[PDB]
Structures are given as structure tokens and as C-alpha cells.
Amino acid sequence: VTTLRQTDPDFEQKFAAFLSGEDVDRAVREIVDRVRREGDSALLDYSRRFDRIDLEKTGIAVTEAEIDAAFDAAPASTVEALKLARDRIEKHHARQLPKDDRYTDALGVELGSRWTAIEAVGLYVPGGTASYPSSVLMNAMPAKVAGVDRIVMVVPAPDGNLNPLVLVAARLAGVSEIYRVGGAQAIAALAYGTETIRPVAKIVGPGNAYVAAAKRIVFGTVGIDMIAGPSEVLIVADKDNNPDWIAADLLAQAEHDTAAQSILMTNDEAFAHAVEEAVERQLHTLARTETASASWRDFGAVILVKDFEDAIPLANRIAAEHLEIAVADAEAFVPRIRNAGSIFIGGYTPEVIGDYVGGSNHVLPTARSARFSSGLSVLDYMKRTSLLKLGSEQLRALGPAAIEIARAEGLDAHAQSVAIRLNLLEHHHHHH
Amino acid sequence: VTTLRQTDPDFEQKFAAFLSGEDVDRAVREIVDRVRREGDSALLDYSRRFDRIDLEKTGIAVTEAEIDAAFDAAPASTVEALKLARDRIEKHHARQLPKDDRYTDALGVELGSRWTAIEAVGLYVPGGTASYPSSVLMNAMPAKVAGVDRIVMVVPAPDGNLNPLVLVAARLAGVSEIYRVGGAQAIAALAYGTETIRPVAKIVGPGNAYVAAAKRIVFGTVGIDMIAGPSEVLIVADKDNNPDWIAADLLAQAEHDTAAQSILMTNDEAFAHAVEEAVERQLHTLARTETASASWRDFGAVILVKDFEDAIPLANRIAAEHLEIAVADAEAFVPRIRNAGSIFIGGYTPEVIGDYVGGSNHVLPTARSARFSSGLSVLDYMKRTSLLKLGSEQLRALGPAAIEIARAEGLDAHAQSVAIRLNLLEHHHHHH
Ligand SMILES: N[C@@H](Cc1c[nH]cn1)C(=O)Cc1ccc(OCc2ccccc2)cc1
Ligand SMILES: N[C@@H](Cc1c[nH]cn1)C(=O)Cc1ccc(OCc2ccccc2)cc1
Ligand SMILES: [Zn+2]
Ligand SMILES: [Zn+2]
Ligand SMILES: [Zn+2]
Ligand SMILES: [Zn+2]
């Protein structure tokens, strides 16, 4: 598969090219506007059109009765595994809850930082085969931990089919309402609201091209997590690893999407060869290797470096969603590689564990977005409010400076709101 | 001016209406794509076209020499006031720096949360009269405090004119590079990079319709703070306030933009009348009341409630950028009003103080965005990376659950990356 050699005088050009990489807009714009202006009426319309479903009969909201039945149908070990994941995710996220900060500075000004949960959030969950209960837990649990009052999930049911495990996960994660809708129409319903779906304040959850374009439109009206990009895993490993294990980790990622990218960065060419052979073999032992195969062939890559000091700047440019570090003295590289959504350390930490039961959130920054964003955390479901309180002495002390800047900015009304107070106050400060 | 009465049987309908509220897209899409595909060449083109400037002569980058001269021209008291603001903003933001969190749970799994600064950020600063040095400090200081390696500012110079105070503030706030460009073309240059402007990882700073549309396009390629909306102030006050002071606070906000909104929520109609009279009078004592007057007439409003318990849900729906609370026992309402970008407490805390020297950031969530976002903080210039490390015992303990979920999701490659390790490992755990 694609192999880049840092040796190569053309390595940089090739590497930069490797790192690089429509009218749906028009269509989405109309769908979103129509749902906004018309409501439930437009939702059903678009739902029939895209999900071949008749919500007037199935109903838009999933019932607690339908959720109860999903639990029954589920294998006991599946429900228990989901509960273990829910518990581990909750405990870990609880630790990240922000603490308020109220204090008084040297001048006596009272400054404060207070956090509150967003009142209502909507989680978008793709339907059909891409419908994962693990994703429901990852997206919903932080909201529940944060204290979000109302957590809504929208999940389309093409041809009327919903994954029962998604309903099981939803309940476990504290999801309040569930609506059988998706696409740009569901995003529009959550942002603007309809007769059946009261609006929410933020929408999280990756979707297809129609969902992404709709999220771009509504951003500002509601908060949004980020626009989904192609998923990836960067594995930095030396020869002292089991080639079969590394190949398995690369293929796990690859089976997600035909556009998923798996990358091996190593300093041992022979080992790179061993991993490739393992990928080829496993590609045959496993079934349904249609997607994985396509992903590995079209986007897989090996990057050969002389040593791992060289791998550092390259790993930072890749800014992978998931980074597995399997080299000696692995801990020593963690601080050096600043751009990575999640880092998995050692041979016994396949990234897959993080997708499910580690505790950290698997909703991570993709497509180089790790250069500027973090994976989902309770902070994404909360907001900070600044608090400020000045007494007469404080205003007397900081007011002149404020007035000076306001006037230099030509904002006379701004200067006057301070001046009007100081003019009166000053008559008590003629001794200094 | 516009007065709403919660008494009114039609209050809710009127209030909801009061709370509500193009082809630029096509144009911006082309500008952004052209700058992306063509670089510096397109930047100059668009700069001549929109700023009537010839960058081939003035140069794109502002020189340290040009920055030095800006300092000289500035009044000593203006430079000192800006330094006081810079210092107060820095001290306050420093307190908000995140702390990493590495720990070991009961099963022995090592979980970690680590924070790093974004490597490079670009700050967009409008040109001409809307060019505020205070805004430069507010946008740049948190980045400097966060440890951002490269801080770039783009500020257009229509007809070749730049506000010297913007250059003064830039230096004080740790801005590294400054380019004389703006609009969708500057946003495109920062996101995709040109021969002269190396790309950045995140762009912050409100702009006009062209900038906002460009930011919506590049979101995902680079992080963005939020799309600017109309500015506002909500003042909740009882009769025990100086009507002139309250009027001044409303007008300070109003002078910002003809679309700025100032709102008085009170439980005393006579007092509301007194404030209105003060607004009218001050509207004549102050000069350049062209914008303020337009803002107050077109968007000003008084909301009359019976008591402040009633004001709470209304204030939460307004979700104001700035909220001044001037009533008895003010501190008691702070926790009750969860949606507000910044809260100013008491009669001696005009919001204007926060714009300048309080310490908190004046880049705040507007247009009801306080329902889901926070004002700018060091966290906006940093990102969290999750760390996970499992030993053989831990994988043996959590692996089965992972495998179970993976298989229930039909992700056999995912299950195999865990199974391949457990199969080998299990041969050491036949005693339990
Ligand atoms: N390792 C995964 C997490 C995980 C979930 N289940 C197994 N692994 C990850 O962190 C990235 C990721 C997240 C969501 C996701 O969405 C599923 C989807 C696929 C195709 C179309 C629509 C929706 C796709 C990728
Ligand atoms: N109170 C102000 C902060 C402040 C700055 N100087 C005085 N007050 C606030 O927090 C909100 C705000 C921030 C930036 C801003 O941008 C200036 C601008 C105006 C028109 C077109 C383009 C740019 C406009 C409003
Ligand atoms: Zn080297
Ligand atoms: Zn996965
Ligand atoms: Zn009441
Ligand atoms: Zn202001």
C-alpha cells in the first residue's frame, strides 16, 4: 500500500499532498427553510421522500412502550455490556465537571466564573446500519453528567426500521425524547422547532452530507459540535510489536467507512512489511471486508522514518483523531505529540477499547480538526457566565482608564456611562 | 419606546415575536475558492476591489517600523490605559488556565486529560471606524495567556488607513504578525494560506456579512469562535436606581450599532418612564447620537413585570450578551438567571467597565447564543487530548464487554482487534 519515505527528496511535497483533502447546499437550504416555515407538515413530507416512511401512522415520537420492547429483544450480555460502558463513561466524564471560580482581586473587584448546563440538547444518530448504540452512550452520557435538563434524540427509521439497541442505549444514557426523523429536515426541526418537536439549544452528532450542510446553516441559531470529517487512526510503532495486532488495529478503523484512513508510521521497513502481510491475511479471515478492504487500499499508508524523533513533527501535522503509540518508552512521546484527539498507550490498548468501554468519549475531532478541537466532553454541554461587581472605590480606580479608551475609540456614550457615575462620586475624593 | 406588559393576555405572543429575528453566500463562495486556488494574487485583487488599496506598494504585512510609529503618535494616557487593561485581562484569564488530569481507576486503567495550546490563531479585526484597540486586547490576550505559539491579526486598511491604536494594542497583546487585509478574502487566506500568509488553525473575531459567510464555509478546515450576531444589553432594575445612570447604560450599548438592542426590565412603570426621559435628554447632550438614536428607537424596549421572580424566566429566554442586575439583593438573582454571557452586579458596575478593564472578556455570545455558548476564554485557544493505557489485566477485564458491543454493531474488525489479544492472553487466566 501507499508508502512514504522521509528519506525522499520529494517526501515533503508528497506528504503535504497526502495530507490534503456539492449542490447539496442548494437543496438543504430549501429543506431547512421549508421545515422552519412549515413545521411538522414539511417533516413528514421530507420523511416520506427520504426514509420511505409515513409518520402520520408510525407517529413521530417513539413510545416508552416501543423502548420497553427493545430491551426485551436484546441479549442479556448485550444489555450488560452497554451498562458497563455507560457506567465507565459516566464516571470518567463526572471527573471533568467544571468548578465555578468567584474571587476578589487586590483592588477589591469581585470577579467570577460560573458554569451552567445547556437547557436542552438534541443528538443526531444516523439510521440503518450506521446506527450504533455505542455512539448513543458517548453522545448522551456527557449531557446527562453535565446536567442537561432535556436530552432529545432524532434517529431516522428508513423503511420504518430502527436499531433496537439504539433505543436501549438511549434509555440507559438518560435520553428524554426520541423522534423518528433524520437528514437536514431533522436538524431544521431541532434548531427551529415544530409543533411536535420543541427546539433545543445545541445539536451534536455526525451525519451525512445533508446533515453537515444543515448544521452549517443553523450554527449561530443553535450550537453545534463540529462538522463530521473522514475518520482515522495513526499508529506509531517500532519492531517490538506483534504485526498481527497492529494490522488488526488498522483494519478495525478501516471497516468504519470506505473513506476511513489508517496510517502506520514506523522506523523499521521489514516490520512495515510484516504488518502489511498481516493486513492482507486478516482481510480474508474476516467477513464483510468490503469496506475495510476499500479503506485500506484507497487510504491506507505507511510512513517510514529513521527514528521517532522524526515522527513527532509528522504526527503533529497529521493531527489524528486516534493515535496509538506502541514504541519503547511510549510515555515519553505523549507530551511531544500535541495534536491528537485521543492517545492510546502500549500494545494492550487497541483504540477499539476507547470506542466502547475505556471511559473517554469516542466522539472525536476528525480530518485534522485535532489541531484546534477536542473530543466531546461535559464542557460541550455547559457554558460559562462571567460575573463582575465593582463598588464605588473600584469604579473610581478603574473608571478613568475606561473613559480614556472609550474616548480614544470615539464611543462617547460608553465614556458617559462611566463619567456620569464618577462626576458625582469624585466629590467625595478631593483629598487624593 | 416599545413596551411589553406581562399583564397582557397577548404578552407571550408579543414577547415571542419580539425575541425572533443573502446572495452574499454565492459571492463569498467564489471569493474564498479563488483565494484558496490562487493565493496572494487573488488577495490583492480583492483588496483593490473592496479596500481601494494597492498592497503591491503598501505591502501586505505591517512592519515593526510602522508599529513603532503608531506608539509614538499615541497620547501617553491612552497607551497607559491600554496597558492597564492588558494587565487586568491577562491576570484574570491566567486564572482560567486548565489543569491536566491523569489518574488510575479501581481496575487499574490509566485515564488522562491533557491540554495544549492551539499552535497558530488568526484574529480578525474590522477596519475603519469599527476598528477598536480594546477588541484587539480582548481577542489576543487570552491566546497569549493560553500559550499560542503564533498569533496573527488581519485588519483591512480601507483607502490605506489603519487605526494606529490597533497596532499599539496588537503589540501589547502579543500579536506576532499583522496583515492589511480583510473580508472573505482574508478569512480564506488564514484558513487555506497564501504565499505570504501561512495558514492558522483557528480564526476568531466578528466581522460583516462577507466575513460571517466566509467563516461558515471554512469551519471544519479551521476552528471558528462563532458567527457574530446583533449586540445587546438587558438591564433588570428596580426603582431604587438613578434613572440617568440606567439610561446612560442603555445608550452606551445602543451607540455600537444601529442593530444593537437595549432592554430595560422593571417592576415599576413610573421608573421606566423616568429612564425613558433620561434617554431622551442624554440623546441630546451627547454628540454623534446618530447610531444610538437609531438603535434605541428601532430596538429599545421596556418589559414590565409584577416582581422579579417573574423576570427570571423572561431574562433566561432573552439570554443577553450582557446583563446588568440593579435590584435589592442582586446576588440572589445571579444563580437564578442561567443564560447570560456576562452579568454586571450593582449600580457601580456599568457594562462598559467589562468592555475595557474589568478583566473578563468582552467577546461575548450574542443573539441568544448565550443559551449555548460562553464568551471567549483561554479554553478557546487550547484543546484537550484524552489519554488511555490498559495493561493485560485491564484488557482481560474490559475486553469481553467491548467485543460484545462490537459484534452487536456488526463491526467484526473492531471485535477482532480485541479478540486477537485476548485469545493469546486467556491462556494465562484459566484459574478464574
Ligand atoms: N471508532 C469510532 C467510534 C465507534 C463506534 N462504534 C465503533 N467505533 C470513532 O471514534 C469515529 C466515528 C464515530 C461515529 C461514526 O458514526 C457512524 C457513522 C458511519 C457512517 C455514516 C454515518 C454514521 C463514525 C466514526
Ligand atoms: N461592549 C462591546 C465591547 C466593546 C468594545 N469597545 C467598546 N465596547 C461588546 O461586548 C460587543 C461587541 C464587540 C465587538 C464589536 O465589534 C465592533 C464592530 C462594530 C460594527 C462592525 C464591525 C465591528 C461589536 C460589539
Ligand atoms: Zn531523526
Ligand atoms: Zn470504531
Ligand atoms: Zn410574580
Ligand atoms: Zn461596548
Side-chain angles (χ1 to χ4, degrees):
Chain A
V1 68
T2 302
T3 300
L4 289 174
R5 295 148 186 289
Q6 198 168 34
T7 284
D8 291 42
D10 297 305
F11 169 82
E12 174 53 35
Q13 172 170 29
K14 286 182 178 307
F15 183 62
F18 168 81
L19 295 176
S20 77
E22 299 182 300
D23 297 301
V24 50
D25 290 350
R26 166 186 178 178
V28 174
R29 191 171 318 116
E30 188 47 64
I31 295 173
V32 175
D33 181 77
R34 261 201 72 216
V35 168
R36 176 184 186 173
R37 293 168 179 278
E38 296 170 48
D40 279 352
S41 166
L43 242 194
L44 309 185
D45 177 4
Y46 292 121
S47 290
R48 295 191 299 270
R49 203 183 304 193
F50 306 125
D51 308 331
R52 281 97 44 194
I53 180 64
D54 184 301
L55 305 172
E56 300 179 306
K57 292 183 178 177
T58 72
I60 303 180
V62 173
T63 65
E64 292 315 297
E66 305 183 303
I67 297 172
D68 296 317
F71 266 82
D72 300 325
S77 52
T78 301
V79 174
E80 286 306 306
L82 289 173
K83 287 182 178 182
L84 166 53
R86 175 202 56 196
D87 293 347
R88 287 194 57 83
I89 296 167
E90 173 172 55
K91 188 138 43 192
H92 176 65
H93 282 87
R95 281 181 71 92
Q96 312 197 321
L97 287 168
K99 311 308 300 296
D100 292 346
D101 176 21
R102 292 247 226 164
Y103 71 100
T104 302
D105 66 9
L107 292 68
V109 178
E110 299 184 8
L111 294 296
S113 176
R114 167 208 73 199
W115 295 84
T116 54
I118 291 174
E119 299 164 292
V121 304
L123 317 175
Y124 184 84
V125 176
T129 50
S131 212
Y132 302 130
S134 62
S135 288
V136 176
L137 294 184
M138 289 301 174
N139 282 293
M141 284 307 291
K144 186 264 190 190
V145 170
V148 173
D149 314 50
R150 180 172 164 249
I151 304 167
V152 182
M153 178 169 55
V154 298
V155 54
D159 305 306
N161 309 312
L162 286 177
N163 178 173
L165 289 180
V166 157
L167 293 179
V168 171
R171 170 166 289 160
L172 297 182
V175 167
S176 281
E177 303 156 34
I178 305 177
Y179 299 99
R180 257 183 289 267
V181 298
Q185 59 274 14
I187 296 297
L190 291 168
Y192 302 112
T194 71
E195 306 96 306
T196 306
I197 306 180
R198 299 292 65 226
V200 296
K202 180 153 181 176
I203 300 173
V204 310
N208 56 41
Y210 273 60
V211 168
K215 288 170 64 178
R216 278 184 200 282
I217 288 170
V218 302
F219 180 46
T221 299
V222 286
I224 65 162
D225 52 348
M226 173 64 53
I227 304 161
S231 178
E232 76 271 341
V233 70
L234 166 56
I235 300 182
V236 178
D238 59 28
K239 66 173 183 57
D240 293 343
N241 289 101
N242 181 329
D244 294 313
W245 287 19
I246 300 305
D249 293 350
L250 293 166
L251 285 175
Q253 153 63 184
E255 78 174 343
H256 259 309
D257 190 84
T258 47
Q261 179 154 72
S262 296
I263 307 166
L264 172 67
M265 182 165 285
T266 185
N267 69 328
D268 196 272
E269 187 155 9
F271 177 67
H273 291 323
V275 175
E276 301 200 17
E277 303 192 315
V279 172
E280 294 301 352
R281 283 155 40 210
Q282 288 175 18
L283 224 32
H284 294 178
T285 71
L286 294 177
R288 303 171 182 174
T289 60
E290 291 173 23
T291 302
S293 185
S295 170
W296 180 246
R297 307 305 191 198
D298 302 313
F299 304 87
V302 171
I303 299 180
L304 305 173
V305 297
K306 286 295 188 175
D307 55 70
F308 298 105
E309 281 300 307
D310 297 337
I312 297 174
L314 301 175
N316 283 324
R317 289 169 67 183
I318 292 167
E321 169 189 38
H322 299 111
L323 169 63
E324 289 192 1
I325 304 185
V327 305
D329 194 33
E331 291 292 346
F333 291 85
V334 175
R336 317 282 303 291
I337 299 177
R338 57 194 290 181
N339 301 327
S342 297
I343 297 184
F344 303 89
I345 309 166
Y348 290 98
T349 316
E351 112 84 316
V352 169
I353 286 305
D355 291 352
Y356 297 125
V357 302
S360 64
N361 212 281
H362 77 195
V363 184
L364 303 153
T366 63
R368 318 269 109 78
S369 67
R371 314 193 320 292
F372 60 83
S373 55
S374 314
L376 196 70
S377 80
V378 296
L379 302 181
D380 292 303
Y381 295 101
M382 305 176 86
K383 70 284 210 297
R384 193 213 303 269
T385 290
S386 284
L387 307 169
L388 179 63
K389 177 179 181 180
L390 278 79
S392 60
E393 283 292 312
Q394 290 71 39
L395 183 63
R396 210 276 180 161
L398 302 166
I403 290 168
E404 178 78 30
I405 299 164
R407 281 172 187 164
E409 295 186 336
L411 300 171
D412 294 311
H414 277 65
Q416 205 53 47
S417 61
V418 181
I420 202 169
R421 295 181 160 77
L422 293 189
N423 292 337
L424 164 55
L425 215 68
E426 194 52 31
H427 301 304
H428 309 302
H429 299 74
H430 294 309
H431 55 293
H432 61 49
Chain B
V1 68
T2 302
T3 300
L4 289 174
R5 295 148 186 289
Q6 198 168 34
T7 284
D8 291 42
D10 297 305
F11 169 82
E12 174 53 35
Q13 172 170 29
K14 286 182 178 307
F15 183 62
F18 168 81
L19 295 176
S20 77
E22 299 182 300
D23 297 301
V24 50
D25 290 350
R26 166 186 178 178
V28 174
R29 191 171 318 116
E30 188 47 64
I31 295 173
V32 175
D33 181 77
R34 261 201 72 216
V35 168
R36 176 184 186 173
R37 293 168 179 278
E38 296 170 48
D40 279 352
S41 166
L43 242 194
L44 309 185
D45 177 4
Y46 292 121
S47 290
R48 295 191 299 270
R49 203 183 304 193
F50 306 125
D51 308 331
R52 281 97 44 194
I53 180 64
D54 184 301
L55 305 172
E56 300 179 306
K57 292 183 178 177
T58 72
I60 303 180
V62 173
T63 65
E64 292 315 297
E66 305 183 303
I67 297 172
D68 296 317
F71 266 82
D72 300 325
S77 52
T78 301
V79 174
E80 286 306 306
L82 289 173
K83 287 182 178 182
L84 166 53
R86 175 202 56 196
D87 293 347
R88 287 194 57 83
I89 296 167
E90 173 172 55
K91 188 138 43 192
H92 176 65
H93 282 87
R95 281 181 71 92
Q96 312 197 321
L97 287 168
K99 311 308 300 296
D100 292 346
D101 176 21
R102 292 247 226 164
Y103 71 100
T104 302
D105 66 9
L107 292 68
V109 178
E110 299 184 8
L111 294 296
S113 176
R114 167 208 73 199
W115 295 84
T116 54
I118 291 174
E119 299 164 292
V121 304
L123 317 175
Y124 184 84
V125 176
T129 50
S131 212
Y132 302 130
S134 62
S135 288
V136 176
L137 294 184
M138 289 301 174
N139 282 293
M141 284 307 291
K144 186 264 190 190
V145 170
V148 173
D149 314 50
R150 180 172 164 249
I151 304 167
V152 182
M153 178 169 55
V154 298
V155 54
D159 305 306
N161 309 312
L162 286 177
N163 178 173
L165 289 180
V166 157
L167 293 179
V168 171
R171 170 166 289 160
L172 297 182
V175 167
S176 281
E177 303 156 34
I178 305 177
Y179 299 99
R180 257 183 289 267
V181 298
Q185 59 274 14
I187 296 297
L190 291 168
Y192 302 112
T194 71
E195 306 96 306
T196 306
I197 306 180
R198 299 292 65 226
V200 296
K202 180 153 181 176
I203 300 173
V204 310
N208 56 41
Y210 273 60
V211 168
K215 288 170 64 178
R216 278 184 200 282
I217 288 170
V218 302
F219 180 46
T221 299
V222 286
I224 65 162
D225 52 348
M226 173 64 53
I227 304 161
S231 178
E232 76 271 341
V233 70
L234 166 56
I235 300 182
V236 178
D238 59 28
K239 66 173 183 57
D240 293 343
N241 289 101
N242 181 329
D244 294 313
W245 287 19
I246 300 305
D249 293 350
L250 293 166
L251 285 175
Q253 153 63 184
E255 78 174 343
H256 259 309
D257 190 84
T258 47
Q261 179 154 72
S262 296
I263 307 166
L264 172 67
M265 182 165 285
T266 185
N267 69 328
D268 196 272
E269 187 155 9
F271 177 67
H273 291 323
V275 175
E276 301 200 17
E277 303 192 315
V279 172
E280 294 301 352
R281 283 155 40 210
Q282 288 175 18
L283 224 32
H284 294 178
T285 71
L286 294 177
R288 303 171 182 174
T289 60
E290 291 173 23
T291 302
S293 185
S295 170
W296 180 246
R297 307 305 191 198
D298 302 313
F299 304 87
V302 171
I303 299 180
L304 305 173
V305 297
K306 286 295 188 175
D307 55 70
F308 298 105
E309 281 300 307
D310 297 337
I312 297 174
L314 301 175
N316 283 324
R317 289 169 67 183
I318 292 167
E321 169 189 38
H322 299 111
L323 169 63
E324 289 192 1
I325 304 185
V327 305
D329 194 33
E331 291 292 346
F333 291 85
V334 175
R336 317 282 303 291
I337 299 177
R338 57 194 290 181
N339 301 327
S342 297
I343 297 184
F344 303 89
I345 309 166
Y348 290 98
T349 316
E351 112 84 316
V352 169
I353 286 305
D355 291 352
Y356 297 125
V357 302
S360 64
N361 212 281
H362 77 195
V363 184
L364 303 153
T366 63
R368 318 269 109 78
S369 67
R371 314 193 320 292
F372 60 83
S373 55
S374 314
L376 196 70
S377 80
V378 296
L379 302 181
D380 292 303
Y381 295 101
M382 305 176 86
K383 70 284 210 297
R384 193 213 303 269
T385 290
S386 284
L387 307 169
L388 179 63
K389 177 179 181 180
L390 278 79
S392 60
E393 283 292 312
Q394 290 71 39
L395 183 63
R396 210 276 180 161
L398 302 166
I403 290 168
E404 178 78 30
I405 299 164
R407 281 172 187 164
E409 295 186 336
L411 300 171
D412 294 311
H414 277 65
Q416 205 53 47
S417 61
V418 181
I420 202 169
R421 295 181 160 77
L422 293 189
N423 292 337
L424 164 55
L425 215 68
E426 194 52 31
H427 301 304
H428 309 302
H429 299 74
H430 294 309
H431 55 293
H432 61 49

